[PDB]
Design a protein around this nucleic acid. Structure first.
Ligand SMILES: [Mg+2]
Ligand SMILES: [Mg+2]
Ligand SMILES: [Mg+2]
Ligand SMILES: [Mg+2]
Ligand SMILES: [Mg+2]
Ligand SMILES: [Mg+2]
Ligand SMILES: [Mg+2]
Ligand SMILES: [Mg+2]
Ligand SMILES: [Mg+2]
Ligand SMILES: [Mg+2]
Ligand SMILES: [Mg+2]
Ligand SMILES: [Mg+2]
Ligand SMILES: [Mg+2]
Ligand SMILES: [Mg+2]
Lengths: 137, 116, 85, 49, 208
RNA sequence: AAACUCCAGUUGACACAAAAUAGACUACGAAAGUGGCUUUAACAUAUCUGAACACACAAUAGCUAAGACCCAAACUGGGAUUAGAUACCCCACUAUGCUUAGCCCUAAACCUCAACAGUUAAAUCAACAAAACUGCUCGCCAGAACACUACGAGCCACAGCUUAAAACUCAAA
RNA sequence: AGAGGAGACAAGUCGUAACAUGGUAAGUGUACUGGAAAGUGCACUUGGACGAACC
């Protein structure tokens, strides 16, 4: 067969598996990459929290939190905890365009978690709430 | 190419203007320079691996030799790649043509926004 | 309210997470989502938004016309046939 | 210094057909070299600088 | 410089000229043929073809030199090497047969290994940003690394903390300490590494 | 730094707020304005100009009265910066932005380019801008500043809006 | 007649608001606030720019 970038659809028969688990059962790694922080929470497919790690939880403070290095350290810590809890493959869902958007992912790979899919869930309102006023710099 | 009919504010154009350019929409006989890409700090991941191993091994180089060597190799590769990137920019293979040769080509066939 | 793991999802091929993330970012960029998020960080007043849109449309027109001229003239970049005259 | 002779006669007509180029010697040389190149097309180091 | 740009730095290596022609590659053959037509600078008095020539030790001697007094600097260097060898011989004789194998007695090897141990891996660059100055960690070239090791050794030996101790003795003691991964210079390298690790969060401030 | 840790992350329920992409389209309206979806009503004039003596509209801001309140945010308070910082930067919150009923009637309300009909012929054309013009009509303009001012008058407006001078001064603007 | 305003005279004082991206782009309307030029909110204007093929 040919590899498809589109994810398999729930309710459809798919031959793809990961340690005998379907795509609907792989745990989810939520990476909120804010402009000043990066938080990574690993949860089960049944929505059971397993690990959590943020740049703040790694001992980084103030502007040092919003760096690729801090996000990578947080990713390593979260991946280590998830692997302690028995997690191998993960579906990565990232929201936000902070500096830690990608580096945190790398940390997970350095931690020992295999990324089977990457999803962007950055909240893009269809002109809903009004954001804060523009800065003068 | 987007249409320009009825866009600019002109006599005989009844509607309000669509475009308000600050410069005339006339092709110049030169292109912009080959803009450099702002350099990013490199080998950060290997540096992080080396520093974490230092923290775990109390900054003892003997234990960390492998990661230290990896970081050094990455640094040397980054420096040599910067030099090769300068060489490639001089070569101009990546782009369709260098800005200088493109400026020469446009000089050969200049735009004519006037009558003669 | 929609289903999950369908929108903005890219499957990783043989652990090539770098290429998967590059493809995801390219998709978001081509669809314009990245610029939309960046512009929605701070509120853009309607006059400023109109000015930006006008500037970008004029820039698009100029860039497309310049690219068309460059492609049209690129065939004339060949060697000089009448060298010395 | 070597001086170029008068380039036209009593009538005013210049002697060389490339006079009005202003560089009749150089352009005549270029013309001859180009003609030689055309002839060669039609038919078909260390010790010097 | 009184040498025109045509002049090339001379190459002093007997093996390079005694190499058989058959082993020579086409590139090496072309280089050798080309060198017959270039101009060559006069051989500097510092370096010769002697088998006992060490560029590292010559550079260390030059760095120890004060006011162009290379006789004194060379005397200090040879006295330091002699002191290192004598101390190693004393330890070798005073140690048991098992420890005799492990004890090193070549002063040149001790010097090179001490400099290699003293070599720092990651340096700090002061970068201006937002009106402040940050000690951003950076990689270091091998040249700067060796120079930093040599300069740290010399500066530590020249410190006023050591009273009435001659330079050869101080330098020998520091070289032996560094060879065993101990002493003030190794501590300086460790402090630099610790500061770089602490400032790791500032690594992104670097633009090169 | 202050602030919040009844906080943050996932999941589910969840609006009197605002309407990604389409839109590289240039449409509707007299202008102001109008870019989520559906339905209803509906977009004057079978010559043109024409009201500052009227009639009807007129962004945003603002007032009045009753509601909604996610988010934003004058003022205010705190943190920071600074020589000071009554600001720029950060945090919290109010009037306000929204709905309904009245007011207020102002904008760089500018596409600073009037409506209608016509020409590209030439004598094209100060400069720049968005080429030069012709016929007809209405409105406006006549050195700068005083002056979006004073007085008078009109207005639901009462620190307001419209119309709007003069004296002293200068050889400029 | 106590005062307000305008202009001239032009000082000294407190700042540096405008002219360059004038160092927070400038300005209009309007509201609030401030020793003072002025600051901020909301909408609007270019009488600013965005460097004008890709990168
Ligand atoms: Mg009429
Ligand atoms: Mg109104
Ligand atoms: Mg409120
Ligand atoms: Mg708020
Ligand atoms: Mg504020
Ligand atoms: Mg609404
Ligand atoms: Mg308008
Ligand atoms: Mg007014
Ligand atoms: Mg008035
Ligand atoms: Mg009155
Ligand atoms: Mg200023
Ligand atoms: Mg300013
Ligand atoms: Mg303003
Ligand atoms: Mg204020």
């Amino acid at each position: 067969t040919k590899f498809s970038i589109y994810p398999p659809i729930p309710g459809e028969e798919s031959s793809l598996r990961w340690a005998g688990k379907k795509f609907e059962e792989i745990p989810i790694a939520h990476i909120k990459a804010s402009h000043n922080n990066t938080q990574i929470q690993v949860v089960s497919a049944s929505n059971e929290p397993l690990a959590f790690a943020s740049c703040g939880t790694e001992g980084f403070r103030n502007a040092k939190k919003g760096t690729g290095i801090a996000a990578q350290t947080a990713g390593i810590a979260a991946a280590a905890r998830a692997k302690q809890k028995g997690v191998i493959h993960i579906r990565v869902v990232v929201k936000g365009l902070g500096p830690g958007r990608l580096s945190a992912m790398h940390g997970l790979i350095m931690g020992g978690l295999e990324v089977i899919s990457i999803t962007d869930n950055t909240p893009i309102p269809h002109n809903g709430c009004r954001p804060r006023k523009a800065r003068k710099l | 190419t987007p249409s320009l009919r009825g866009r600019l504010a002109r006599f005989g154009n009844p509607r309000k203007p669509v475009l308000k350019p600050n410069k005339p929409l006339i092709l110049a006989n030169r292109v912009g320079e080959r803009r450099r890409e702002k350099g990013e700090a490199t080998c950060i991941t290997e540096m992080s691996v080396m520093m974490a191993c230092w923290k775990q091994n109390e900054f003892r180089d003997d234990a960390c030799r492998k990661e230290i060597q990896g970081f050094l190799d990455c640094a040397a590769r980054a420096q040599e790649a910067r030099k090769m990137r300068s060489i490639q920019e001089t070569l101009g293979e990546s782009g369709s043509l260098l800005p200088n040769k493109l400026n020469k080509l446009l000089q050969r066939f200049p735009n004519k926004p006037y009558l003669s | 309210k929609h289903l999950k793991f369908i929108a903005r999802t890219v499957m990783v091929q043989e652990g090539n997470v770098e290429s998967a993330y590059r493809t995801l970012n390219r998709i978001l960029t081509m669809d314009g989502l990245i610029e939309d998020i960046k512009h929605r960080r701070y509120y853009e007043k309607p006059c400023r938004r109109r000015q930006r849109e006008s500037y970008e449309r004029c820039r698009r027109i100029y860039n497309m016309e310049m690219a068309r001229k460059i492609n049209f003239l690129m065939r004339k970049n060949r060697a000089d046939p009448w060298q010395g005259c | 210094p070597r001086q170029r002779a008068i380039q036209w006669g009593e009538d005013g007509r210049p002697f060389h057909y490339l006079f009005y180029t202003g560089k009749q010697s150089y352009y005549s040389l270029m013309h001859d070299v180009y003609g030689m190149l055309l002839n060669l097309e039609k038919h078909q180091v260390i010790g010097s600088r | 410089s009184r040498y025109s740009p045509e002049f090339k730095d001379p190459l002093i290596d007997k093996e390079y000229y005694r190499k058989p022609v058959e082993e020579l590659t086409e590139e090496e053959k072309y280089v050798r043929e080309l060198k017959k037509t270039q101009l060559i600078k006069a051989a500097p008095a510092g370096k010769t073809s002697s088998v006992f020539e060490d560029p590292v030790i010559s550079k260390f001697t030059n760095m120890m030199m004060i006011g162009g007094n290379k006789v004194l600097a060379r005397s200090l260097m040879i006295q330091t090497l002699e002191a290192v060898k004598r101390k190693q011989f004393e330890k070798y004789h005073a140690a048991s047969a098992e420890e005799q194998a492990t004890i090193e007695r070549n002063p040149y090897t001790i010097f090179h290994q001490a400099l290699k141990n003293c070599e720092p891996m990651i340096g700090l660059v002061p970068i201006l940003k937002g009106g402040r100055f940050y000690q951003v960690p950076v990689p270091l070239p091998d040249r700067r690394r060796r120079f930093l090791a040599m300069k740290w050794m010399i500066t530590e030996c020249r410190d006023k903390k050591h009273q009435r101790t001659l330079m050869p003795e101080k330098l020998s003691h520091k070289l032996l300490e560094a060879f065993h991964n101990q002493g003030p210079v190794i501590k300086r390298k460790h402090d630099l590494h610790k500061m770089a690790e602490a400032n790791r969060a500032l690594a992104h401030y670097r633009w090169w």
